[PDB]
DNA sequence: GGCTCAGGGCCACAG
DNA sequence: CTGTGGCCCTGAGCC
Protein backbone atom coordinates (compact mmCIF):
# COMPACT_ATOMS: atom_id res chain seq x y z
CA UNK A 1 0.00 0.00 0.00
CA UNK A 2 3.06 2.21 0.11
CA UNK A 3 4.88 3.65 -2.87
CA UNK A 4 8.56 4.38 -3.34
CA UNK A 5 9.52 8.02 -2.60
CA UNK A 6 11.54 7.97 -5.83
CA UNK A 7 10.19 5.85 -8.69
CA UNK A 8 6.74 5.59 -7.11
CA UNK A 9 6.35 1.81 -7.40
CA UNK A 10 4.71 -0.47 -4.86
CA UNK A 11 7.21 -1.20 -2.11
CA UNK A 12 8.34 -4.76 -1.51
CA UNK A 13 9.67 -3.76 1.89
CA UNK A 14 12.58 -2.13 3.68
CA UNK A 15 15.49 -1.78 1.28
CA UNK A 16 18.51 0.50 1.73
CA UNK A 17 16.82 2.33 4.61
CA UNK A 18 13.51 2.98 2.86
CA UNK A 19 10.27 1.38 1.78
CA UNK A 20 11.26 0.60 -1.78
CA UNK A 21 10.49 -1.85 -4.57
CA UNK A 22 12.71 -4.37 -6.34
CA UNK A 23 12.95 -1.81 -9.14
CA UNK A 24 14.73 0.60 -6.79
CA UNK A 25 16.78 -2.20 -5.26
CA UNK A 26 17.77 -3.69 -8.61
CA UNK A 27 18.46 -0.40 -10.40
CA UNK A 28 20.32 1.02 -7.41
CA UNK A 29 22.70 -1.95 -7.43
CA UNK A 30 23.03 -1.85 -11.21
CA UNK A 31 24.08 1.77 -10.94
CA UNK A 32 26.30 1.80 -7.85
CA UNK A 33 27.90 -1.66 -8.18
CA UNK A 34 28.82 -1.24 -11.84
CA UNK A 35 30.15 2.23 -10.97
CA UNK A 36 27.65 3.89 -13.27
CA UNK A 37 27.52 7.66 -13.39
CA UNK A 38 25.10 9.80 -15.36
CA UNK A 39 24.30 13.47 -15.84
CA UNK A 40 21.14 15.35 -16.75
CA UNK A 41 21.53 18.18 -19.26
CA UNK A 42 19.11 20.46 -17.46
CA UNK A 43 17.30 20.21 -14.12
CA UNK A 44 19.42 17.68 -12.21
CA UNK A 45 16.27 17.08 -10.21
CA UNK A 46 13.52 16.49 -12.76
CA UNK A 47 10.04 15.24 -11.93
CA UNK A 48 10.62 11.62 -11.02
CA UNK A 49 7.42 10.05 -12.29
CA UNK A 50 6.53 6.64 -13.70
CA UNK A 51 7.52 7.67 -17.21
CA UNK A 52 10.19 10.29 -16.54
CA UNK A 53 12.07 7.94 -14.19
CA UNK A 54 13.20 6.15 -17.35
CA UNK A 55 14.51 9.16 -19.26
CA UNK A 56 16.70 10.53 -16.47
CA UNK A 57 18.81 7.82 -14.76
CA UNK A 58 20.90 10.49 -13.03
CA UNK A 59 17.82 12.22 -11.64
CA UNK A 60 16.52 8.85 -10.45
CA UNK A 61 19.88 8.12 -8.81
CA UNK A 62 19.90 11.54 -7.14
CA UNK A 63 16.31 10.91 -6.11
CA UNK A 64 17.35 7.67 -4.39
CA UNK A 65 20.14 9.28 -2.36
CA UNK A 66 17.96 12.32 -1.65
CA UNK A 67 14.95 10.35 -0.37
CA UNK A 68 17.27 8.54 2.02
CA UNK A 69 18.52 5.40 0.28
CA UNK A 70 21.83 4.36 1.79
CA UNK A 71 24.63 4.22 -0.76
CA UNK A 72 26.77 2.36 1.77
CA UNK A 73 24.17 -0.41 1.67
CA UNK A 74 25.35 -1.34 -1.80
CA UNK A 75 27.55 -4.37 -1.29
CA UNK A 76 29.18 -4.12 -4.72
CA UNK A 77 31.53 -6.78 -3.38
CA UNK A 78 29.25 -9.86 -3.59
CA UNK A 79 28.47 -10.77 0.03
CA UNK A 80 24.67 -11.05 0.21
CA UNK A 81 24.88 -10.06 3.86
CA UNK A 82 24.68 -6.37 3.07
CA UNK A 83 23.68 -5.52 6.62
CA UNK A 84 26.05 -2.78 7.72
CA UNK A 85 26.26 -0.76 10.96
CA UNK A 86 22.87 0.78 10.16
CA UNK A 87 21.22 -2.66 10.12
CA UNK A 88 19.28 -2.00 13.40
CA UNK A 89 17.53 1.01 11.81
CA UNK A 90 15.41 -1.28 9.63
CA UNK A 91 13.56 -3.01 12.45
CA UNK A 92 13.75 0.11 14.60
CA UNK A 93 12.11 2.37 12.03
CA UNK A 94 9.64 -0.38 11.17
CA UNK A 95 8.63 -0.80 14.82
CA UNK A 96 8.18 2.96 15.24
CA UNK A 97 6.55 3.54 11.85
CA UNK A 98 4.02 0.74 12.26
CA UNK A 99 3.98 0.13 16.02
CA UNK A 100 0.98 -2.11 15.42
CA UNK A 101 0.38 -4.66 18.16
CA UNK A 102 -0.14 -8.40 18.05
C1' DG B 1 20.47 -21.92 18.53
C1' DG B 2 16.96 -20.66 16.05
C1' DC B 3 13.37 -17.43 13.28
C1' DT B 4 13.53 -12.82 11.27
C1' DC B 5 14.68 -9.38 8.26
C1' DA B 6 17.02 -7.37 4.61
C1' DG B 7 20.42 -7.41 0.75
C1' DG B 8 22.99 -9.41 -3.53
C1' DG B 9 22.63 -12.55 -7.33
C1' DC B 10 20.83 -14.06 -11.36
C1' DC B 11 16.21 -14.26 -13.99
C1' DA B 12 12.68 -13.62 -16.69
C1' DC B 13 10.06 -10.80 -19.03
C1' DA B 14 9.39 -5.83 -21.14
C1' DG B 15 11.50 -1.79 -24.02
C1' DC C 1 20.15 -7.15 -27.46
C1' DT C 2 19.43 -4.10 -23.55
C1' DG C 3 17.20 -3.06 -19.64
C1' DT C 4 13.51 -2.50 -16.11
C1' DG C 5 11.73 -4.65 -12.45
C1' DG C 6 11.65 -9.24 -9.76
C1' DC C 7 11.91 -13.58 -7.51
C1' DC C 8 15.29 -16.44 -4.99
C1' DC C 9 19.11 -17.64 -1.92
C1' DT C 10 22.22 -16.42 1.07
C1' DG C 11 23.61 -13.81 4.73
C1' DA C 12 23.68 -10.11 8.74
C1' DG C 13 20.69 -9.50 12.62
C1' DC C 14 18.21 -9.99 16.28
C1' DC C 15 15.18 -12.80 19.43
ZN1 LIG D 1 10.67 1.81 -6.23
ZN1 LIG E 1 16.69 14.78 -15.70
Secondary structure in 3-state letters for chain A:
CCECCCCCCECCEEECCEEECHHHHHHHHHHHCCCCCCCCCCCCCCCCCCCHHHHCHHHHHHHHHHHCCCHHHCCCCCCCCCCCCCCHHHHHHHHHHCCCCC
CA distance A15 to A25: 7
Q: What is the CATH number of the domain that holds A97?
A: 3.30.50.10
Protein footprint of strand B, defined by Cβ closer than 7 Å to any strand atom: A 13-16, 22, 25-26, 29, 33, 73-83, 87, 90-91, 94
Angle between helices A22-32 and A57-67 (to 10 degrees): 110
Please, are residues A4 and A11 in contact by the beta-carbon 8 Å criterion?
A: yes
Q: What is the number of domains present in chain A?
A: 1
Q: Which residue is nearest to nucleotide B8 (CA to C1')?
A: A80
Please state whether A31 falls in left (phi above 0), alpha (psi between -120 and 50) or beta: alpha
Experimental method: NMR
Residue A9 belongs to domain spanning: 1-102
Amino acid sequence: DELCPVCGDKVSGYHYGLLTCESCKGFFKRTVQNNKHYTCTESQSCKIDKTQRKRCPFCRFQKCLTVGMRLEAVRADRMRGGRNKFGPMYKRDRALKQQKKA
